[PDB]
Symmetry: D2
Subunit: 393 residues, 4 copies
């Protein structure tokens, strides 16, 4: 009856123009899936479906999920499809898996997400049928398909300044939150707390192989004083900066989704039980609020109250989004993004939801905490949340 | 289990390559169908729990096509939406996704469909972000890179389908006979008014005014076996597949309501089909045209139907060769296979086609009083999707 | 030691997106040169140099003039170079030829110009080293390298509205001049007056040929009433429209330049003597005035005055430029662009100067007029003029 | 009347992706012209014309020569035009000037050339009227308009392998020539022999200012042993490498051309008399041979024999071209590219001819040598040569 997550694994997260800049999103997912199969010893024929989140599908080739599955070493008989709920896509893949299992379409699904923002191409809308006369634009696909609202064409960061204004989120509070994310992430990383969830990727370049084993996007030297000096990135009188938002990152995460009975039968070690799912939508312009209704839905399904939850893992799309969700729900600061968030480690859009589920799977194992919520705000005005309970042993 | 049903299946007419819809984004086509569906049904917009849309060529369509379809279709901003991609099967996948959400208790009512506009697919410049440095560089047609070329070989779907032709010994003449028959069946059904009920007109604004696009335009009623025999192979020098025994590069949208039978009745909807069986299968990428065979067998097994129980099979004409291989492998009577013609005539707007075929069957069973149908599509990359569908008695 | 023009020939002029849209400028020039050699029977080894004007060189390949020469059938031993004085380039090629002959560097030069504005590519300045993040521009080379001023980045038509304001050139006068250009051109064309100067080009398509034999860009049905309805193209409350300016055209012209003695020695039939050359420069913003100082310089060299000249052939860059030059010099309206101009036939930038020299060579032969001036205004603020006399 | 060159000056030559990568060719020419006017005190009204060579005109804006003239500070009443005889363009500008003066069209011309190969754009031939369906090419303009033959579409370096084969030019001879070019250039540079001809350019960058005062493309540490290790650049079994050919360089040069009488009247100090001009053409495929007929034409006009010439300055388009021209004409190695050539300093195509005239003007002043020949081979199968005599005082 219970649907469980087993063997959650992720790549380290690459910086913009960083170690993963030449490695397609689909190749990162294939690497995690191959490693997952090697470590679990799961019979590849027991995989009924591969579901992968991917937002910037432009130029990635036919059906990213099918490339992840086949290049990950699964038999050609394993079906696969790609899901896009923007920032929530990596968590959506796990919700899709849950729905397939609960509806009887699948017994075991490999679910996750992939993204590489460097690898997003430029688009030429006028090249097919011609520009005819006069200058024409080449669009950055990461803005057109990933970060700009589809209704306004304004950046997500520009819209988030209206969330800042509505909830009176001070520059000082955003920079305090951002510095704390960096400090928490650096301490956890140094303590080895992310080694269990990370699978190394070997990158071959010119006359070199480089073993990419550790998240590279974080800035342990970040201070409130340093952050206060940065210029607003999206509006002249704004509060959001390069320092209180994540970068343009690359990575992949994947996990096994099955009934508890299926996991036990196949000698898997379940990490989390899915106790509740929430998917909600709000005004595109206030998309940072999306986690609030989504979390309420997930908690209602789990029959939990906010104060019953050991940790909330809410995507740091902006420091401002973290603060609005934490403060609106009255979550204790010590229980909110406990080991740091995307401001430190990065936001590889379509993978981030799978990365946060992976983080919580390993954090509950280490701490013996019982109850967690993963939630992400979603460009276009949506929210996704999963209520998750540790499985013992 | 309560029965999961399809209600109010509707589609745009299908545009030709460089045709009437060439300047109308896929998301705008879906928005138009959703708006019309809400207007005609009077469905309370707050009772829509999710919009799921198939779309294969997402490049340049903007953030989350399904959310654009939902919001521009007039649904409240409180309705969530996501986009699915199982290539050619995406429009049928959206309905399977809806089924799974309802059966799992995540949703009570979903608007599901698909959208595609192949003219609107942009060119891609992989080297523009970090530079070409020195030497010529390529601009990729996204239609090929993300839609029609296999991701493993980079060869066209049509090139791979010549290996299906060789394996099953499908003659050029058999493919051209099938293609001519698809055009003749489609033209006769169209002229008889059999597609009027499923089609919603789209008003297109241009420099020189408005065009009311009300009728499929990609079909060639004058097609003959003799005319098709004149054409050159499109994909291999010694090949059999031509521009005439394959569909075009088309544009369109289709959408429908998916819910329990009880939910449909409660909200004053008129269910058209019950989903009796779902099959999703995968095969060698190189032999993807065979995908419907295992998918149909899975869907029939779930419905507890045999091939001979099915009044009509609606199998996507990705190529005439795929239609022939699937029909003959399953032993389906030619008179019961793509009865009113298929994609060779009306077109293959990739991510919408699965939703278009479900829509076609919903209206055809209502007209004929046929009881049982199977919709199936082969899928680039080596997959197959099938739904076993039963008419609801109204 | 008179320098003469012989065997001036041109292609018909193609419309924007018209019959020549798939035929490179260099191929148009090659075709004229091949035809010129076939008709004259000139020994190819007697050609010392090929000089070709071409403004939009982007994407045309290494040295357009050398492609015209070699693809035109001349021996590989014939040197060639490409000149760019924007709108004046096709006339500049003939001035370059004159200078080479008078200085003893050459005895016989094939000089002309080529342009195909459809064939001008788009430019991607950010593709070499990357756009990194954010949308980036692809430039239309015909604007960047051909029609926009290099200092202001404003269109030539936008700058010409300041010439209109300075000289108080009414919209009605511009439209009357434009209608008259169309009417004069259509009547002359119908009378066969352009047959002698035009060489047909065969264009190969699908499984088909098109023989392109006649200018296609003109609008014989043009009226003042029709032109009055058009919207300003360059400024909101402007006077310049699509109807009182030329299009974005394609074509080529070429001719033999030599001493009179060399022409006679080689059995050529000289058409014109170059009696005077003027090259002048003005404010980029008032480039339409450029022909005035250039014409005065050319007339001074020829020891002619305006009233001595049977016809002026001044490029119709805009109707406004034609009117300003005509009225500043006091030229009789019936002696100014007598058989119509670029508003009707088109302005294939780098070829136009060679096309106007070609037109005048054939018009003086037909009319027995003695004296002509060819002049063009030049984007960036220049003018070129040649004073020309009919050879018997 | 003698036609003379006065006040020949050049920028230092930039490396590919080097100091001048963001400075348009037209701006480099403007800087030389402005400096030339400032130093000579020449009355700007006495300039009858500016003629500039430029090969890669794509994207440089309307009429590069007019931009050089106007941005160089000359009155708008000075006419200007741009010439293109590919690699010979910078020398062609001086021949054009000579012809204008001798024919009476001009009394005084500022002639030179400009090029910036980094600044050459990519071209999209199919963007105006559309690619319709299928992949399409974006062309590197430096290949399409500058370095690939217009008839074969093969690189100039690929064609030069046929010159190598015809004249049996060994790899070892090419590498010896290239090493010697580097050694000669480095010694001459260190001796201060290029200070007189070079005008510094101040480059304003994001982070501040660079005073670019010295040629940067040369490799003084070059050895025959090092060059022997390099892979062929153009054919698998080839001899031409990155080390025995010049780079993709940027720079400008300009000079005053006038009668001797005009120069003296205006207080200029003539450096060279033009005693002979040769322009020749050959098979496009053997364009490296072009200097041979061109030099014979220039020497015939000057009534000189090869052995009467104190130094030959023949553009090092490839080491192979230098060797073929030197050995075909029987020129003493000690009198051929005496202070090094383009393999060391670079080949900024449309400027190189003006750079070589400038180099010879200053070298004859220093050495009191009487007679020089400047010659360049030209893509498409041409050659240009000038026979030049030192003017005293």
């Amino acid at each position: 009856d219970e649907i469980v997550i087993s063997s959650a694994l992720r790549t380290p997260i690459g910086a913009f123009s960083g170690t993963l800049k030449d490695t397609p999103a689909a190749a990162l997912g294939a690497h995690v899936v191959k490693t997952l199969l090697e470590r679990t010893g799961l019979a590849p024929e027991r995989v009924d479906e591969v579901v992968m989140g991917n937002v910037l599908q432009a130029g990635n080739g036919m059906n990213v999920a099918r490339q992840v599955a086949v290049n990950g070493g699964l038999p050609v008989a394993v079906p696969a499809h790609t899901v896009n709920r923007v920032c929530g896509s990596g968590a959506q893949a796990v919700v899709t898996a849950y729905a397939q299992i609960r509806s009887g379409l699948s017994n075991l699904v490999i679910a996750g997400g992939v993204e590489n923002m460097d690898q997003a191409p430029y688009l030429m809308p006028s090249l097919r049928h011609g520009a005819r006369m006069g200058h024409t634009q080449a669009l950055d696909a990461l803005l057109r398909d990933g970060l700009n609202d589809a209704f306004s064409d304004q950046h997500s960061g520009w819209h988030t300044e209206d969330l800042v204004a509505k909830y009176e989120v001070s520059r000082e509070a955003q920079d305090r939150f951002a510095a704390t994310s960096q400090q928490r992430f650096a301490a956890a990383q140094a303590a080895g707390w992310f080694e269990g969830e990370i699978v190394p990727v070997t990158i071959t370049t010119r006359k070199g192989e480089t073993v990419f084993a550790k998240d590279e996007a974080n800035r342990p030297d970040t201070t409130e004083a340093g952050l206060a000096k940065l210029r607003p990135a999206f509006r002249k009188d704004g509060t959001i900066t390069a320092g209180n938002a994540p970068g343009l990152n690359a990575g992949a995460a994947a996990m096994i989704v099955s009934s508890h009975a299926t996991a036990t039968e196949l000698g898997l070690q379940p990490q989390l039980v899915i106790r509740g799912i929430g998917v909600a939508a709000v005004e595109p312009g206030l998309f940072g609020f999306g986690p609030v209704p989504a979390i309420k839905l997930a908690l209602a399904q789990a029959q939990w109250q906010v104060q019953d939850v050991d940790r909330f893992e809410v995507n740091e799309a902006f420091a401002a989004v973290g603060l609005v969700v934490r403060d609106e729900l009255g979550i204790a600061p010590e229980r909110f993004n406990v080991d740091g968030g995307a401001i430190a480690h990065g936001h590889p859009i379509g993978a981030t939801g799978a990365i946060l589920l992976t983080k919580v799977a390993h954090a509950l194992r280490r701490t013996s905490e019982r109850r967690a919520v993963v939630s992400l705000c979603i460009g276009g005005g949506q929210g996704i949340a999963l209520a998750l309970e540790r499985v013992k042993l």
